[PDB]
Amino acid sequence: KKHTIWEVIAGLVALLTFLAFGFWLFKYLQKK
Numbered sequence: 001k002k003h004t005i006w007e008v009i010a011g012l013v014a015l016l017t018f019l020a021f022g023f024w025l026f027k028y029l030q031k032k
Helices: 006-030
Strands: none
Touching: none
């Protein structure tokens, strides 16, 4: 169709996770 399940769980979570945590992980660990 378009891909696998990512666009169903990832594109649905990763986008709601990668950023949520990313905005920190880096801005905290990558910025120290």
